[PDB]
Design a binder for this molecule. Structure first.
Ligand SMILES: [Zn+2]
Ligand SMILES: [Zn+2]
Length: 201
C-alpha cells in the first residue's frame, strides 16, 4: 500500500527527526536501531533535525494509530510511542508509515489476497479495515506481501483471540502465509520501498 501521492515522498529520501523527551536511554537506542534498519536496506536516510520545516518527532504519547503516512509537510509529524508500543519492530512499522506505506491489507487489490471477516470485527473498529481508494495507492508492480511489516495479524481488532478478522485466500510456497510479523522489514517491503524512493537498481 505505497502512497501514489508524489508530495508524500520525502525529498531525496531524507527524513529529519527529533527524539522527544520522557524516553529512557534504551528506548532512544531502539529508535535509532529502527532508523538504521531502514537505512541499511533502502536509500532512505534519517538526519537529526536542525531547522527543516518538515520532520518526524518520536513523541511520548498513548499507543494507537495513526502516524501520518509519508511527508505531511508544513511542520512536524509525531510518531506516538509509549510503554505498550516501543519495541524495535513496532517502531520499524511506524517508520513504514512515515516512509509512505499504508497498511498492506488496505491495498485497493486486497480482496484478491485476503478475506476480511466482518463477523469478527470488534464493534466500532470496522474503519481499520477500509481499503484505500485506488487513486491513493500505486503498488509499483509489487505483489501483495503477507510478510510485510505493514500487515496486520490474523486477529487484529477481533471480538475473540481465536476469531480471525483477516484470512489469506491462498498458500505461498506450500504453506498458509503467516501474517503480522513485527521482527524486520520483509523482502517485499524493501523491494517496494526502493521503487518508491527510486533507489538505484
Ligand atoms: Zn500501522
Ligand atoms: Zn507492500
Amino acid at each position: 500500500a505505497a502512497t501514489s501521492r508524489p508530495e508524500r515522498v520525502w525529498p531525496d529520501g531524507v527524513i529529519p527527526f527529533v527524539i522527544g523527551g520522557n524516553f529512557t536511554g534504551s528506548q532512544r537506542a531502539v529508535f535509532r536501531q529502527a532508523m538504521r534498519h531502514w537505512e541499511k536496506h533502502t536509500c532512505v536516510t534519517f538526519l537529526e533535525r536542525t531547522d527543516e520545516d518538515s520532520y518526524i518527532v518520536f513523541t511520548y504519547r498513548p499507543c494507537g494509530c495513526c502516524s501520518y503516512v509519508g511527508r505531511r509537510g508544513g511542520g512536524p509529524q509525531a510518531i506516538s510511542i509509549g510503554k505498550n508500543c516501543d519495541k524495535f519492530g513496532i517502531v520499524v512499522h511506524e517508520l513504514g508509515h512515515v516512509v509512505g506505506f499504508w497498511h498492506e491489507h488496505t491495498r485497493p487489490d486486497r480482496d484478491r489476497h485476503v478475506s476480511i471477516v466482518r463477523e469478527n470485527i470488534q464493534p466500532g473498529q470496522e474503519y481499520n479495515f477500509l481499503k484505500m481508494e485506488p487513486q491513493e495507492v500505486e503498488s509499483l508492480g509489487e505483489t501483495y506481501d503477507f510478510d510485510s511489516i505493514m500487515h496486520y495479524a490474523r486477529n487484529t481488532f477481533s471480538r475473540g483471540i481465536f476469531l480471525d478478522t483477516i484470512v489469506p485466500k491462498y498458500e505461498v510456497n506450500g504453506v498458509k502465509p503467516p501474517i503480522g510479523q513485527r521482527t524486520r522489514l520483509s523482502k517485499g517491503d524493501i523491494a517496494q520501498a526502493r521503487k518508491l524512493y527510486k533507489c538505484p537498481a
